[PDB]
Design a protein around this ligand. Structure first.
Ligand SMILES: [Cu+2]
Ligand SMILES: [Cu+2]
Ligand SMILES: [Zn+2]
Ligand SMILES: [Zn+2]
Lengths: 153, 151
């Protein structure tokens, strides 16, 4: 349970720290922190399956999908576990993240620890895109920066 | 929780990939490291998977049982204590280990933590001072990475 952290690094400008708290044990995770260098607007934000950075952000694999369902937004029953939808960058390209999710977890099974968190090139269409890609990645595009979700204090 | 891997990266020349296999049995830790200075190099697990301020924020060695620093085979050691990997003349350490004092799924879960490789030799604790009681006089943290689930 409780406290995690993930330094997001890439090959371009975007970088940021994302902290995770989980007070109880089987419940909701507050995700918060700050990411820079982004273009203004919406950006896909998910946990991928593998905390594998060998071949960069590519090695993280697909979205963390322990239930093997289809891609969706954070509020849809048919979602991926990694599916945290979007974060939002102001101008200055800064995205003060503040999310609360009750599917992802720091404890077990849905435990996203040692997994990869990705912020994307474009908006996540939350499964509503109307193509096959929209059901896999929500059309979020490249992976701008990523990091392995590790234990904190 | 059977396979893991870590990209040891550092703000210098030292860098390499390390793998982990498990099948509550032992763990095989293998891979290579390069850019090292020839000799023995301290190598092991710290407590926090926190790269926020670099290797520093990884904190003290992973020690679930509040004990003195040690070599992998001392009874008294930090669960994370791997002792040394040997960098051949070409700064290339061929790493292979089968520590059963660490695991990928336990209360000693090494997953989500930071693997670290050091300036100098892990004193394995017989260094004759306070410092070798904590770190084994292994010195500065030349590279690190978070241990994460591999495909
Ligand atoms: Cu993603
Ligand atoms: Cu160390
Ligand atoms: Zn998804
Ligand atoms: Zn130690």
């Amino acid at each position: 349970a409780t406290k995690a952290v993930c330094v997001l690094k890439g090959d371009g400008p975007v970088q940021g720290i994302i902290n995770f708290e989980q007070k109880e044990s089987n419940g909701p995770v507050k995700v918060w922190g700050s990411i820079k260098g982004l273009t203004e607007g919406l950006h896909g934000f998910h946990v991928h399956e593998f905390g594998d950075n060998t071949a960069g952000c590519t090695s993280a694999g697909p979205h963390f999908n322990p239930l093997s369902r289809k891609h969706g937004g954070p509020k849809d029953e048919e979602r991926h576990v990694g599916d945290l939808g979007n974060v939002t960058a102001d101008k200055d390209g800064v995205a003060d993240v503040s999310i609360e999710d009750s599917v992802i977890s720091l404890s077990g099974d849905h435990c996203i620890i040692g997994r990869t968190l990705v912020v994307h090139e474009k908006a996540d269409d939350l499964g509503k895109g109307g193509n096959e890609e929209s059901t896999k990645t929500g059309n979020a595009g490249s992976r701008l920066a990523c990091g392995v979700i590790g234990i904190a204090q």
